[model samples]
Target: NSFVGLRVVAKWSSNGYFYSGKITRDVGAGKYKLLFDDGYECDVLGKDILLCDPIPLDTEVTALSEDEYFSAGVVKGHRKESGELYYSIEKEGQRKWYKRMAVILSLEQGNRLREQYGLG
Candidate 1:
């Protein structure tokens, strides 16, 4: 549930960078004003903000693809291109890319991945 005073990471639409912040005010019509960790402020639309939790690559978690069910697997490659942070996850050698925000920590789901390192 999105509410005021919630800590989050938001994309600075103008600069196109995600900054840690807290929701301060609810500006109606899909907008919220947030105060960043740097003490700066921004008004962000709903789609631009996400929880501060970043599930690093190689983490075993449930990741939502455009599909209805979330897949449990280890995060593989990552992307930060065009100001979008994303990750690649594969189950059974069939891989796919999804935004990092769509990935969630699965404390109940762990012990995955066979390889790590020397990959570019």
Candidate 2:
């Protein structure tokens, strides 16, 4: 039940290389960390980690019930030219790019992403 709609990517540190995957749960939320299915944890957020992309992919909420929120999907393909990743989570289709060490999301965050990305 936890593996519902989580989007993940295994990326190389030097040349924007990556292997991406999608999951379906919130697993957990922390200060600056992401735990993967293969037990690979990364701290590319809030720290001085060399990120291939400046912006993280925008995550969205797909389903909702009385007490649970499900991740709908996420968008933003890997950009080879910039050697970075980009995601759009703005409603009026805001295409501006912002840099963050890490951008984490909860149910609330997912909702915002969907709204901004015009997925709602």
Candidate 3:
């Protein structure tokens, strides 16, 4: 029975382990953030499993603008609605939305995403 009630889910950047959390609401133009959650582990390998990362506020990020090209930036904050989450990004004071992603730690990783999204 995969019919668990509403909440949040994701993998950690610190580790590959899957994780889950509850959601909390905040004021200021509708801000939704991840709340602390308990650890539930099963140790299974399947892609069907939902993936949602609890990226903290003020973390460095990578972005390719509407004009297009990889650029450096960070997360202004984050939000989630109906099970989908997005990070409010800022680089050159530009606020953009990046759905479910990670930090641009290395050139290779950044390039991979760029290619994956047809940026290059």
Candidate 4:
């Protein structure tokens, strides 16, 4: 009953902070190995892991590009037709698709940019 390779958010503490990771292996008996997006790994109880929903429509994100390390964009949408997650990234007045792992949720950074550029 393990959904290996799925994105999941595991509750880390009573304070309500959640850590996101991909289920790497089912260690059996309701325990699974999680590989965090930041390159950390740990065994977490299945009960504590919740499937990560798609990033909400229009969520701001900073995406990495071949020419630039980071480019600001908004999430136009996502696609999972082939079972791989990708986001529709709109930046520089153009739209492109990027793997989910290459995009960073950056609402705060987006807000800062908006304010700085008088777009707010």
Candidate 5:
């Protein structure tokens, strides 16, 4: 129902809607990547979502990065035993860094991914 069981791969790029593929793995902390069954690779971090908007058949997608690049999709992260699922963009004086999140994304969206990727 509504492609809930489908693995949607999305890429975050400054150029807008970069590479995308099918979800090859579930959302976990052990390193997961999204790719088509044919091996189409994209730069997607673990626990990222493949959104459907402004593009038909998986187009104009976005990802909640460990850091925020643009004002859109800016999110916070938490730390965990498996490290952080979410990430954050922080600034130290003139320098910038990223911190891992313990809990990432929303529970509803996480549930969506869990249903799609078959994760608990």
Candidate 6:
């Protein structure tokens, strides 16, 4: 009940990769069911999941610039190219690449921070 329908990412211990998904149901006792956006399903412990407000596929996001790396830009889509995950973002109407880790954040973590400062 804590996170039904919220976007989440869970660590896959086998490969040490985090997989993004949506919480579909509460299975009881700190366990929940996950429905991956890529069409996979599994049950995971609550502690294993990180809450997120992931940008939808093909939606625009503010990401770190590929060229400057220190600057931000509008990007769309999480894709893998050349063995790295990237986002294709618009800069001057041209689509360019940005790394995914530089852009994404946890929705739950953000909300907690906001509430801590009385901003929520």
Give the winner by lDDT.
4
C-alpha TM-score for every candidate? 0.45, 0.24, 0.40, 0.52, 0.27, 0.45
lDDT of 2 by residue, 9-83 (tens): 333232332323333333344122444434556543211121222224454312222234322334343243364
Error of 5 at 109 (Å): 20
Candidate 1: the clashing residue pairs are none
> What lDDT would each prediction earn against the true structure?
0.62, 0.33, 0.44, 0.64, 0.35, 0.55
| Best first by lDDT, ranked | 4, 1, 6, 3, 5, 2
lDDT of candidate 5 at residue 21, scale 0 to 100: 42
Q: Per-residue alpha-carbon lDDT of model 5 for 5-83, expressed as tens digits?
A: 3544343332233333455554345334456433665434543444422123211113433355422233233223453
lDDT of 3 by residue, 25-80 (tens): 32222222334254433322122123234444675556545645666677788788
What C-alpha root-mean-square deviation, in Å, does candidate 5 show against the real structure?
14.6
Choose the strongest candidate by TM-score.
4
- Where model 4 places Cα greater than 4 Å from the true spot, the runs are 1-20, 23-34, 37-39, 42-52, 107-120
Query: How do the residues 1-120 of candidate 1 rate in per-residue lDDT, one tens digit apiece?
Result: 556887665665733545456789888788888887668887887666665334455666677777677767776887778976677887667788887556654323321111221000
Q: What are the RMSDs of all candidates, in order?
A: 12.8, 15.0, 14.0, 9.6, 14.6, 9.0
Alpha-carbon runs more than 4 Å astray in model 6: 12-15, 55-120
Q: Which pairs clash inside model 3?
A: 10-52
Greater lDDT among 4 and 6 belongs to 4
Q: List runs of model 1 lying over 4 Å from the truth.
A: 1-54, 109-120
Model 3, residue 20: distance off in Å is 14
**Model 3 residue 42 lDDT?**
30
TM-score of 1: 0.45
